[PDB]
């Protein structure tokens, strides 16, 4: 794993804690509305395809906390929908080719009111996720934590059509 950000930012891999700076592009859908679309900014490449293949997963100890209170989200981990206050374990994804491959995730929000949502200040906390990986060879595991950081001054529409 040597993931990099589309703005040129490289992440640390030796330590458990890490920070990523991703801008936001909110929009509204028919049922929910996406807040953070990471399926473009974050994508990774592996090393040595012939001997060692990789797998990455996340556990149930994820939260939405920070400035915003806990809501009911929706996550697409290259498949179906899971609640963002995660109560289960994700299916497995595999990396093998040396070329860059996207890592598709999505972050939604359940509407409570038809008016709107709170504003996001430039530079704050969004969500906390934990990831753990396993190899084709070694039987042990190595887990680490990621926290997303805010880079854009945008708002969240919640329900209805936000008009300004």
């Amino acid at each position: 794993f040597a993931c990099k950000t589309a703005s040129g930012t490289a992440i640390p891999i030796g330590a458990a804690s890490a920070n990523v700076y991703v801008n936001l592009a909110p929009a509204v859908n028919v049922g929910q509305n996406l807040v953070v679309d990471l399926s473009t900014q974050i994508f990774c490449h592996n090393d040595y395809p012939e001997t060692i293949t990789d797998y990455v997963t996340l556990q149930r100890g994820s939260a939405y906390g920070g400035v915003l209170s806990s809501f009911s989200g929706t996550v697409k981990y290259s498949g179906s929908s899971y609640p963002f206050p995660t109560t289960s374990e994700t299916p497995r994804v595999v990396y093998n080719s040396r070329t860059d491959k996207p890592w598709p995730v999505a972050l939604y929000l359940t509407p409570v009111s038809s008016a709107g949502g709170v504003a996001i200040k430039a530079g704050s906390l969004i969500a906390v996720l934990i990831l753990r990986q396993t190899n084709n060879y070694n039987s042990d595991d190595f887990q680490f934590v990621w926290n997303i950081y805010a880079n854009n001054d945008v708002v969240v529409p919640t329900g209805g059509c936000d008009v300004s």
Partner: antibody
Amino acid sequence: QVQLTQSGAELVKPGASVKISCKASGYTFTDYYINWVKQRPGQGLEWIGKIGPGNNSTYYKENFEGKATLTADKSFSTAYMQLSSLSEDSAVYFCARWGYLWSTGGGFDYWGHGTTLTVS
Amino acid sequence: IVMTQFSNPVTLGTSASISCSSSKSLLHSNGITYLYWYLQRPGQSPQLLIYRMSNLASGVPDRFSGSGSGTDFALRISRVETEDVGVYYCAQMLERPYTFGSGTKLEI
């Protein structure tokens, strides 16, 4: 702080078989791969086979296949190589390691002492 | 895989410039170069020096640096001391047939 040791110098009449081993201590032996390489005066260095104790998978090159095999002992760290169908191979045999356990150096690190396998 | 490289005369305590030429260069998508680089002295065992490209290993000093290019390879030493002398190697990852260099010994 760990070091690698092998065996003593041996002289073997042609037509026989020879045994050289490698000994490791101070780290978990299950995870790291084992590679063996030879150097000769006047010729380039070239490694024989790739072996891993986790799955006991043997990969060899086409030219040195059928000459020897590599095996490691799971209970305590010890590397096996038996030379078969032997000529003029008088050189030095080494034992090497392999990195990249998750995101390390990933190179031919930890090199041991030198021996001699002379022939008559 | 066929690979070609002694050494040029070296001024005492300035710099060294030796090159590794490949019959087929290695640049794959993400733009990282796959090389390997070693050092040894007579009698005493060889030790690793540079992995990937200008990545330091163990506790060796930081004076060892090089330049990366597809068709040319470069590495330079800053200070020459008694144990700095010897013969240097060069290795590439050409799929399953990994191959080392033919050797290149520095001299005064």
